[PDB]
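HUMAN: Quick job: go over this next protein and say how the chain folds.
***
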Amino acid sequence: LGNANFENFIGATEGFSEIAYQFTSHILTLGYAVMLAGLLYFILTIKNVDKKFQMSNILSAVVMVSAFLLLYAQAQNWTSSFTFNEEVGRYFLDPSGDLFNNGYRYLNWLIDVPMLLFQILFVVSLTTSKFSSVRNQFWFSGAMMIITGYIGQFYEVSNLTAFLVWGAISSAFFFHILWVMKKVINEGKEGISPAGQKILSNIWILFLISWTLYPGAYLMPYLTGVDGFLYSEDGVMARQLVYTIADVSSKVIYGVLLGNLAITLSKNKEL
């Protein structure tokens, strides 16, 4: 029962305190609440950019739909998977339940990673690179990153070393994606106004940090060693917080910045 993942492992042995159970539940709720608010934002502001850029708004909205539904479902899965034990005063894995399941989140990554990588290609323009090649490279490596991460996710409890190995293989696809995106950002800068170049610079920093938070949260319970402080409900709380911060940053703030870049590039912003 504690086999599938670290959350279930903790739940079936030490159990979760009131604070850990509540906080995790609240952070995951805020996460899907923000997606829903984002969905409305991207729908309402679609008229603010020229037609030629609106595929980016469209993709932002679709990402919001996906993330709202899958994060909502993940939130319910968290709350219904553990019940309070009066005696000990903690929450434990409920055998009557479905158990905590990472599938919701990994499915969300599979769907959302290619749409996030794709939408920048509709705002900013390449120079020496080709659209189809960059697109194909984003899609292949993005899919492989998530798939090999999912494979790794399986051995988290039963085989920690395989968990790390597949994670490293996954990280290699990630490094490739950073490298392509860096190229896209640099080529995108050529020929647009300095105000647009500065939004692109912020997008890069945001992209770099927010995406790197995902492997960070993946590794979170083992970042303090064999039985360090994070190897506990605190590593669980920390992991779900970082995922949620990453979710809001990589999807919502990224979309907002892209939208602001698109406005800067409207036809009237020229001579």
